[PDB]
Amino acid sequence: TAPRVVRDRDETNFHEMLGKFRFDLQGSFKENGDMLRDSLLQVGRDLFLVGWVKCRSRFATGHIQGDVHALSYMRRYLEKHVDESVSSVRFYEENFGMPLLEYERLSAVNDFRAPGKKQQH
RNA sequence: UUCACCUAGCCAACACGAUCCGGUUGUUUGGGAACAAUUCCCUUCUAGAAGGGUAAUCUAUGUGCUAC
């Protein structure tokens, strides 16, 4: 687990680093956010996403991790290239350069609560 | 492909694998139950006749009875 202090430069290692994404969406969505979740999953597979994501009617956040260069494209896609209406984009934290990764597969957390408890809640 | 999340609610006979045990550890030829009164008649033989017995209990599935 050698840090970037060993010899990363602009020759060949400039595109050999990992990190975490930074995004926090907020605003109303069509139906219950089904369109946004489906669109994000298809694009995420092409970029070989590892982290997870959360989608809902209003709340939309998550933690996405991957390559330093791969995540750069997603920043522009999820800021202007949005078919739905977006109010504003927030940020929580970011970090570039880290040995190995935490997650292994891309998945979206969905509300699988039973319908019986929905009325009580 | 809810690869997710707790398990006093799993197989060692699909397979890998911690420890004990080591059956020339394989092969040739066979078997692996529920149903006995023998070809019964001095009337008959190269064109049809007389006798066949374990009645012990459950679960899951096809199939039947309806008008005086």
Cα–Cα distance measured from residue A114 to residue A96, given in angstroms and rounded to the nearest whole number = 40
A63 touches strand B (CB under 7 A): no
In sign, the C-alpha dihedral spanning A70, A76, A77, A78 is positive
Could you tell me the strand order of the sheet in which A59-61 lies?
Answer: A88-90, A24-26, A59-61, A52-55, A107-109
In sign, the C-alpha dihedral spanning A84, A86, A90, A96 is positive
What resolution does the deposited structure have, in angstroms? Answer: 3.6
Task: Report whether A60 contacts A33 (CB < 8 A).
Answer: yes
A113 touches strand B (CB under 7 A): no
A104 touches strand B (CB under 7 A): yes
A105 touches strand B (CB under 7 A): yes
